[PDB]
Design a protein around this ligand. Structure first.
Ligand code: HEC
Ligand code: HEC
Ligand code: HEC
Ligand code: HEC
Ligand code: HEC
Ligand code: HEC
Ligand code: HEC
Ligand code: HEC
Ligand code: HEC
Ligand code: HEC
Ligand code: HEC
Ligand code: HEC
Ligand code: HEC
Ligand code: HEC
Ligand SMILES: CCCCCCCCCCCCO[C@@H]1O[C@H](CO)[C@@H](O[C@H]2O[C@H](CO)[C@@H](O)[C@H](O)[C@H]2O)[C@H](O)[C@H]1O
Ligand SMILES: [Ca+2]
Ligand SMILES: [Ca+2]
Ligand SMILES: [Ca+2]
Lengths: 498, 78, 495, 50, 49
C-alpha cells in the first residue's frame, strides 16, 4: 500500500507567500496561515491563573487585594526595593503577546503627565515589528528619542508582537530581527542568517526574554540596548560585567553600571529584567537542548489531522493533560509532572520573599548608618562603600530570580543557589553598617522588618503629586513631591496640547 | 494481530480524530516487551531484570523512539 | 518454521548449600564467585572523584594533602561538634569491606579505657553478626558497651556482606535491620512481601539513614530508631525531635538532644548520612529510580552476560558512566558528569557558608550567655529563642553535610535546606544581640575565621595534654582528660 | 559506543586501566573479567619496576 | 520477502570545508564535534593508575 522509505533529513515544509519583503502587519498573515493565526489569537485569554503564574495581569506587589488587582502569591516589598525607579509606579504580571502594546501604553512607568515619557524610545525594542522601519528611518539616533514620540504612530493590534518578529514574511523562515541579539551573535562569530534549527527554536525568544541594559552617553551609541552577556550567563558573570562596564563617578563605584541610586540607602543599583534565556540555557532542559518551543510551542493536531506548532505562548501548566511535556515524558502522569514543577516553585518563591526581606533590612541599615548622629567607627567611609556594594550585589541576585518567569523551574539549582547567595550579601551589608556605627543603629533594626519598614502597597505618578500622601511612609521623605499636572496621554489619545 | 491493528489504525487515520499525543496501549506495551526478551534473553539470563521494572524500556528508555531528545531531532510540521 | 529461541528468559531461582543462619562472607564465595569478585572491588581505596571517592581522609582537613586531608573539606567540623565524639575523628566513607576495620580504628570510640563510652547499637549497621547478638541478649543488647564485642568478631568474614541483604539459602532479598523493620511495621508494611522496586532502595535504607538512640525513658534504652514518623524532609525530622525526647532544660522540655554544645550551651541534634530520606523525594527517587539502579547497575562482565555490580562506590569512577547511559543513552558520559557537578559545586560552596554562620551563631550565643553589661528585659526568653535557632540552623546544614551525594540525590531539597539553615543561624545572632542590647557587637565584627579559628587537631590523646588544651579559646569549655595509656589497638588489648 | 550506541574511535590517549571495565580489552578477551586482565598487566609491571 | 536491512555498512568517506594547509585544532571542531569532544578528555590530569 506504500513504497518508499522515510527520509532522515527532517526537511521543514517550505513556503512562498504573496507578502512583500517588509510586511509587518499581523492581519496580512491571516489569509495564508489561518491555523497558526487562530492559535496566535489564543493569547487573548486573560482570565486563567495557575498556582504561581497565569495570564491575569495583576499587580506583582499586591498580596492584599483579590484578583485582578492582587494575588495570594505576590511580593509585598517590590515598591520599597525599587524606590526612586519607574518600577515603583506599576509592575504587573506578564500576559499574552497580543496585549503587548496595549499594556505598554497604559503602564504608569512611562510618564503620561508630561510630553516626555522620561524613558528612551529603546522601550519599543521588544514590543513591535515596527522597530525595523523606525531604526531604518533614524538609525543610531532612534534609541535616545523620547518614548512618547512613537505613542501615536502604531496600530496596537496589527503592530504588536506578531508574525514578522520571528518570520521572513516571504518564505516564513525563522529570522532574528533583534538588534541587540544580532550584536551578541556577531560578537560570538556566528552568522544570524545561518543558525541551526534547534538553536533558532530558542533564539527567537531570546530576542526579548533576556536581561538587558541601555547605554549611557559615554558607553557607545546613547540608549542603545545591550545584553550583558560577555562574561557568561550566570548572575555572578553579569554582575562582574557590570563592574567593568558603566559610567558611575561615585567614590567606590567608579566605572560600574547603575540603573538608579536608591534614594533611602543611596546605593547605586542594577535592575534585572526577565532573564528567561540566560536561566534556561544552562538548566536541566536547556543544557539538554530542550528549547523554549519544545514546551511553549508544542505540536498540535487541532485542525484536520495536520500538526502545526502551537503559537499560544503561555504557561504549560494550564493544560490538565500536560501534553507538551508528555511528548517526551510519556511515562509520567500529568499529576506527577505538576508536583515536580511545584517541588521547585514553592521552595523558590518562599526563599525569594525571605531574600527580599533581608534586602529591605539592608537598605534600612544603610539608611540609618548614613543618618547616624553618634560616634562613628574609624573606617566608616570604607565600611559604607562595602555595605552599599553588598546591598547592590544582594539585590541584583534576588532580582535576577524575581524577574524570571518560571519561578525556578527553568533552572532549579541556579534559582535556589542565586537566592541563597543574595541573602548572604544583604546580610553582610547589615553587618558592615552596624560596624560603621559601632552597633548604635542596632536598636532601630530589632523587630520584624514588616513593622520597622512597612511594605508600600500604593504608589503611582498621580499620588506622588499629593503632599499629604507623601507623609504616609518614612521612605517617602527621600522622594520629591511631583508638580501638580493633568494627564497628557490616555493610551494613544492625547488629552492636552503640545 | 496485524489485521486488528491495521483495521483500527486505518479507522483512526480516516474517520477518527487522533489527539496531540499518540501513545501505545497496554496490548502493544506487552507485545513489544515480550519481543525484547525474544532477541535479548542471553544478555539477561543470570539476572532478575524482569522483576524491578515492569518493562525493559523503563531502563532502556530511548529504545522507545528517542523520546528524551529535543523535538526538532524528531519532528516537523505536517 | 520453528524458533531458535531455545533458551527462555526466566527469573533466576537459587538453592544453596548454606544453612539458614550462615553469616560468613567467605561461605558464599564458592556458590557465587562472580558477585563475590565484584564485592572484592570495594577494597580499592586509592581513587578520588571531584567531591567524593574512597580515600578515608579527615573531613575537616583542607590543609594537608591526601590521604590526610583534601582540597574539598569542611574546616569547621570540630568547632561545630565541640563536646561530641565527632570532634575526635570523622573520615570520608569507603568500601563495605572496610566497615569493621574502620570501626575499630576510629577515635570516636574510647580506646583509652576498657569501656568505649558508646552503646553496642554502634554495631547495628556494621555486621550481620547483629542477628546472633540480638537473638542472644534481646532488648538488653543495645545498652551494652560497644567494646564488649570488639574481640568477638572477624573484621573480614563478618563485615557488611551477603547475609546483610540475602537469605543464605534462597538468595532472596532480605531486610535484617531492626529499626527499618520497626518503621515498616509502623506503616502496615510486610517486610517479607515488599515489591522489588521498593526492595532495591530499602536494602540500602537499612543503614544509609538518619537515626537516633533511645534515652532511658524513651523505650528500650539505646535502641536505634529512624525519626521518620513526621515525614522525610529536614523540617519534618526537626518537628519529630520537638515531640520525642527527654530534655528537662527550660524552653526545651521533652525535646531530643544528642549533646549540648559546651560553648553556646545549646541542646543539639546530630544528623547522620540521610541518603534514603534525601533520595526518596528527589528527581530520581520520586521517579522510581533506585539506589541499586545507579550503585548496583548491571555489568556485562561474565562473557557478555549481566551480573549486578556489588561494588558500591561513586558512579563517577567509571569514566564511561555506564550505570547512567541506558536511561541517558542520548547523553555523553562527560555531559552527565558536568550535570552532577553543576549541583555539587553549588551545594558544597553553600554548605561552607552555612557552617560559618553557624559557628558565628554559637559564638554570639556564647558571648551573650557570659555578658556582664545591661541585658534586655526579655533576656531569658530571647536566649531560649536564640538557642532554638542555633539548634535548628545546625540540624539543617548537618542534614546536608552528612549526606554523601553533595546534593545530587536531591538538588532542590539540599540547596533549599542550606538556604534555610543560614536564616536560622543568622536569627540566633539577631536574638543574641537583642538580648544584650548590641553589647556583644564589638566582639562579632571580624571575619569569623579570625575570631573563632577552625580547630584542625583534636583527638582523645591530645585532650589529655593540659598545654594543648590552652591553644584555642573554645577548649576552656572542655575538661582536660586523665592521663591514660591506649588499652585497645584494633582488636588487641595492649600490655 | 558514546554517540547514542554508535561507535566512534576514542581520541582520549591515556592509560587503558582508567576504565574499570577494561572495554578496550574485552572484545578480544571477552572470556576474562576486567579484574583478571588488570592483574595480568600488574604481574608484568611490578616485576619490571622492581 | 524483502530485507529490512535498508541501511548498508560502508566505510565512511569525508569531504570537509577546510583548506589543504589547515593546522588549527579549533577549525576541526565544527565538522567533527564527537571526536573533538573525545580529544578534550585529554585535559583530565588528576587520575593515577
Ligand atoms: C518564543 C517563541 C517566545 C516564548 C516561548 C515567549 N515569548 Fe514572550 N513576551 C514579550 C512581551 C512584551 C510579553 C508581555 C506582553 C504583555 O504583558 O502585554 C510577553 C509575554 C510572554 C508570556 C506570558 C503569556 C501569558 O499568558 O502569561 C509567555 C509564556 C511568553 N512571552 C513566552 C516579548 C516577546 C518578544 C519580543 C518581540 C518575543 C520575540 C517573544 N516574547 C517570544 C517569546
Ligand atoms: C526559552 C529560553 C524559554 C522561554 C523564553 C520561556 N520558557 Fe518556560 N515555562 C515552563 C513551565 C513549566 C513554566 C511555569 C508556568 C507556571 O508556573 O504556570 C514556564 C514559565 C514560563 C514563562 C512565564 C509564563 C507566564 O505565565 O507568564 C515564560 C515567559 C516562559 N516560561 C518563557 C516550561 C518550559 C520548558 C520545558 C522544559 C522550557 C524548555 C522553557 N519553559 C523555556 C522557556
Ligand atoms: C503570526 C501569528 C505567525 C504566523 C502566521 C506564523 N508564526 Fe511562527 N514559529 C515560531 C517557531 C519557533 C516555529 C517552529 C519552527 C521549527 O520547528 O522549525 C514556528 C512555526 C511556524 C510555521 C511553520 C509551520 C508550523 O506550524 O510549525 C508557520 C507557517 C508559522 N509559524 C506562522 C516562532 C514564532 C514567533 C516568535 C516569537 C512568532 C511571533 C510567530 N512564530 C508568529 C507566527
Ligand atoms: C559475526 C560472526 C558476528 C559478530 C562478530 C557479532 N554478531 Fe551478533 N548479536 C545479535 C543479537 C540479537 C545479539 C544480542 C543477544 C542478546 O542480547 O542476548 C548479538 C550480540 C553480539 C555481540 C555481543 C555479545 C557477544 O557475544 O560478544 C557481539 C560482539 C556481536 N553480536 C558481534 C544478532 C546477530 C545476527 C543476526 C541473525 C548475526 C548474523 C550476528 N549477530 C553475527 C555477529
Ligand atoms: C528486559 C528483560 C531487558 C532487556 C531485554 C535488556 N535489558 Fe538492559 N542494561 C542495563 C544496564 C545498566 C546495561 C549496561 C551494562 C554494561 O554496559 O555493561 C544494560 C545492557 C543491556 C543490553 C546491551 C546493550 C548495549 O548497550 O550493548 C541489552 C541488549 C539489554 N540490556 C536488554 C540496565 C537494565 C535495567 C535497569 C535496572 C533493566 C530493567 C534492564 N536492563 C532490562 C533489560
Ligand atoms: C538510595 C537511597 C541511595 C543510596 C543509599 C546511595 N545512593 Fe548515590 N550517588 C549517585 C551519584 C552521581 C553520586 C556522586 C558520586 C561522586 O560524587 O563521585 C552518588 C553518591 C553516593 C554516595 C557517596 C559515594 C562516595 O563516593 O563515597 C553514597 C554513599 C550513595 N550515593 C548512596 C547516584 C545515585 C543515583 C542515580 C540517579 C541514585 C538513584 C542514588 N545515587 C541513590 C542512592
Ligand atoms: C583532533 C581534534 C581530531 C579530530 C577532530 C579527528 N581526529 Fe582522528 N583518528 C586517528 C586514528 C588512528 C583513527 C581511526 C582510523 C581508522 O582506523 O580508519 C581516527 C579516526 C578519526 C575519525 C573517523 C571516525 C571515527 O571515530 O573512527 C575522525 C572523524 C577523526 N579521527 C577526527 C588518529 C588520530 C591522531 C593520531 C595521533 C590524532 C591527533 C587525531 N586522530 C586527531 C583527530
Ligand atoms: C587491553 C589493554 C588489553 C589487555 C590488558 C590485554 N590484552 Fe591482549 N592478546 C591478544 C592477542 C592476539 C594475544 C596473544 C595470544 C594469542 O595469540 O591469541 C594477547 C595476549 C594477552 C595477554 C597474555 C600475555 C601476557 O602479557 O600475560 C594478556 C595478559 C593480555 N593480552 C591482556 C589480542 C588482543 C586485542 C585484539 C586486537 C586487544 C584489543 C587486546 N589483546 C587488548 C588487551
Ligand atoms: C523495537 C526495538 C521497536 C521497533 C523496531 C520499533 N518500535 Fe515503535 N515502539 C517501541 C517501544 C519500546 C514503544 C513504546 C511502547 C511503550 O511501552 O510505551 C514504541 C511505540 C510506538 C508508537 C507510539 C507510541 C510512542 O511512544 O511513540 C508508534 C506509533 C510506533 N511505536 C510505531 C513504530 C513504527 C512505525 C516502527 C517502524 C518504523 C517502529 N515502531 C519500530 C519499540 C520499537
Ligand atoms: C549496613 C549494613 C549498610 C548497608 C546495608 C549498606 N551500606 Fe553502604 N556503607 C555502610 C558503611 C558502614 C560504609 C562506610 C564503611 C567504611 O569503611 O568507611 C558504607 C559505604 C558506602 C559507600 C562509599 C563507598 C566508597 O566511597 O568507596 C557507598 C557508595 C555505599 N555505602 C552505598 C551503598 C548502597 C548503594 C547500598 C545498598 C545496596 C548500601 N551502601 C548498603 C553501611 C551500609
Ligand atoms: C577492533 C579493532 C574491532 C573491530 C575490527 C570491530 N569491532 Fe566491534 N567492538 C570493538 C570494541 C572495542 C567494542 C566495545 C564498544 C564499547 O563501547 O564497549 C565493540 C563493540 C561491538 C558491538 C557491541 C557489543 C557489545 O558489547 O554489546 C557489536 C555488536 C560489534 N562491536 C560488532 C562488530 C562488527 C559487526 C564488526 C565488523 C564490522 C566489528 N564489531 C568490528 C572492537 C572492534
Ligand atoms: C527586550 C530586551 C525588552 C526591552 C528592551 C524592554 N522590554 Fe518590556 N517586556 C519584555 C518581556 C520579555 C516582557 C514579559 C516578561 C515580564 O516579566 O514582564 C515584558 C513586559 C513588559 C510590560 C508588561 C508587564 C509589566 O511590567 O507591567 C510592560 C508594560 C513593558 N514590558 C514595558 C517596557 C518599558 C517601559 C521598557 C523600557 C524601560 C521596556 N519594556 C523594555 C521585553 C523587553
Ligand atoms: C533510569 C532508571 C535512570 C538511571 C539509571 C539514571 N537516571 Fe538520571 N533521570 C532519570 C529520570 C526518570 C529523570 C527525571 C527526568 C525524567 O525523564 O522523568 C532523570 C534526570 C536526570 C538529570 C537531570 C536532573 C538533575 O538533577 O540534573 C540528570 C543530570 C541525571 N538524571 C543524571 C544521571 C546520572 C549522572 C545517573 C547515573 C549516576 C543517572 N542519571 C541515572 C532516569 C534515570
Ligand atoms: C547491600 C545489599 C547487598 C549485599 C551486602 C549483597 N547483595 Fe547481592 N544483591 C543485592 C541486590 C539489590 C541485588 C539485585 C536484586 C534483584 O534485582 O532481585 C543483588 C543480587 C545478587 C545476586 C543475583 C545475581 C545478580 O548478579 O543479580 C546474587 C547471586 C548475589 N547478589 C550474591 C551476593 C553475594 C555473593 C554477596 C557477597 C559478596 C552479596 N550478594 C552481597 C544486594 C546486596
Ligand atoms: C516466484 C518464485 C518464488 C520462489 C522464491 C524466489 C523469489 C523470492 C526470493 C527473493 C530473493 C530475496 O530473498 C530474501 O533475502 C533477504 C536477505 O537480503 C532475506 O532477509 C532476511 O535477512 C535479513 C538480514 O540479512 C533480515 O533483515 C530479514 O528480516 C530476513 O528475512 C529474506 O528473508 C529473503 O526472502
Ligand atoms: Ca503570565
Ligand atoms: Ca566515599
Ligand atoms: Ca542522628
Amino acid at each position: 500500500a506504500g513504497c518508499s522509505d522515510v527520509s532522515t533529513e527532517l526537511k521543514t515544509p517550505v513556503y512562498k507567500t504573496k507578502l512583500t519583503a517588509e510586511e509587518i502587519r499581523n492581519s496580512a498573515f491571516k489569509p495564508e496561515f489561518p491555523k497558526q493565526y487562530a492559535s496566535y489569537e489564543r493569547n487573548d485569554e486573560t482570565t486563567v491563573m495557575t498556582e504561581y503564574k497565569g495570564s491575569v495581569p495583576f499587580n506583582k506587589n499586591d498580596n492584599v487585594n483579590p484578583l485582578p488587582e492582587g494575588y495570594r502569591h505576590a511580593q509585598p516589598y517590590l515598591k520599597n526595593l525599587w524606590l526612586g525607579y519607574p518600577f515603583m509606579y506599576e509592575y504587573r504580571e506578564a500576559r499574552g503577546h497580543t496585549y503587548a502594546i496595549q499594556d505598554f501604553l497604559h503602564i504608569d512607568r512611562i510618564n503620561r503627565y508630561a510630553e516626555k515619557g522620561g524613558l528612551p524610545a529603546t522601550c519599543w525594542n521588544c514590543k513591535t515589528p515596527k522597530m525595523m522601519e523606525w531604526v531604518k528611518e533614524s538609525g543610531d539616533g532612534f534609541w535616545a528619542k523620547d518614548v512618547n514620540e512613537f505613542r501615536d504612530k502604531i496600530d496596537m493590534k496589527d503592530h504588536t508582537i506578531g508574525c514578522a518578529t520571528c518570520h521572513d514574511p516571504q518564505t516564513m523562515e525563522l529570522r532574528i530581527t533583534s538588534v541587540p541579539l544580532t550584536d551578541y551573535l556577531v560578537s560570538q562569530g556566528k552568522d544570524p542568517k545561518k543558525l541551526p534549527r534547534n538553536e533558532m527554536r530558542a533564539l527567537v525568544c531570546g530576542q526579548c526574554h533576556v536581561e538587558y541594559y541601555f547605554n549611557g552617553p559615554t558607553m557607545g551609541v546613547n540608549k542603545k540596548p545591550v545584553f550583558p552577556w560577555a562574561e557568561g550567563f550566570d548572575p555572578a558573570d553579569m554582575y562582574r560585567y557590570y563592574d567593568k562596564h558603566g559610567d558611575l563617578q561615585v567614590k567606590g563605584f567608579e566605572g560600574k553600571f547603575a540603573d538608579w541610586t536608591h534614594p533611602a540607602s543611596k546605593t547605586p543599583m542594577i535592575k534585572a529584567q526577565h532573564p528567561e534565556y540566560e536561566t534556561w540555557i544552562n538548566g536541566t532542559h536547556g543544557a539538554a537542548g530542550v528549547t523554549c518551543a519544545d514546551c511553549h510551542m508544542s505540536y498540535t493536531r487541532s485542525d484536520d489531522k495536520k500538526k502545526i506548532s502551537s503559537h499560544w505562548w503561555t504557561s504549560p501548566m494550564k493544560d490538565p493533560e500536560m501534553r507538551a511535556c508528555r511528548q517526551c515524558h510519556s511515562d509520567k502522569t500529568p499529576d506527577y509532572l505538576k508536583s515536580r514543577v511545584l517541588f521547585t516553585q514553592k521552595r523558590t518563591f518562599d526563599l525569594l520573599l525571605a531574600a527580599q526581606e533581608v534586602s529591605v533590612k539592608a537598605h534600612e541599615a544603610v539608611r540609618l548608618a548614613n543618618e547616624y548622629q553618634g560616634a562613628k567607627a574609624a573606617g566608616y567611609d570604607d565600611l559604607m562603600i562595602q555595605a552599599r556594594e553588598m546591598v547592590r550585589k544582594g539585590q541584583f541576585f534576588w532580582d535576577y530570580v524575581s524577574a524570571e518567569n518560571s519561578v525556578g523551574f527553568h533552572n532549579p539549582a541556579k534559582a535556589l543557589d542565586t537566592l541563597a547567595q543574595s541573602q548572604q550579601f544583604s546580610q553582610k551589608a547589615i553587618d558592615l553598617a552596624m560596624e560603621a556605627t559601632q552597633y548604635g543603629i542596632g536598636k532601630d533594626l530589632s523587630g520584624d522588618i514588616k513593622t520597622i519598614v512597612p511594605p508600600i502597597l500604593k504608589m503611582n505618578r498621580k499620588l506622588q503629586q499629593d503632599p499629604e500622601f507623601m507623609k504616609t511612609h518614612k521612605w517617602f521623605q527621600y522622594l520629591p513631591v511631583l508638580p501638580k499636572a493633568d494627564q497628557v496621554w490616555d493610551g494613544q489619545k492625547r488629552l492636552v496640547s503640545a | 494481530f496485524k489485521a486488528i491493528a491495521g483495521a483500527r489504525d486505518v479507522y483512526m487515520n480516516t474517520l477518527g480524530h487522533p489527539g496531540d499525543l499518540i501513545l501505545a496501549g497496554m496490548e502493544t506495551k506487552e507485545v513489544v516487551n515480550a519481543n525484547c526478551k525474544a532477541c535479548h534473553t542471553m544478555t539477561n539470563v543470570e539476572v532478575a531484570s524482569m522483576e524491578a521494572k515492569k518493562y525493559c524500556t523503563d531502563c532502556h528508555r530511548n529504545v522507545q523512539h528517542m523520546r528524551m531528545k529535543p523535538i526538532s531531532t524528531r519532528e516537523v510540521a505536517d
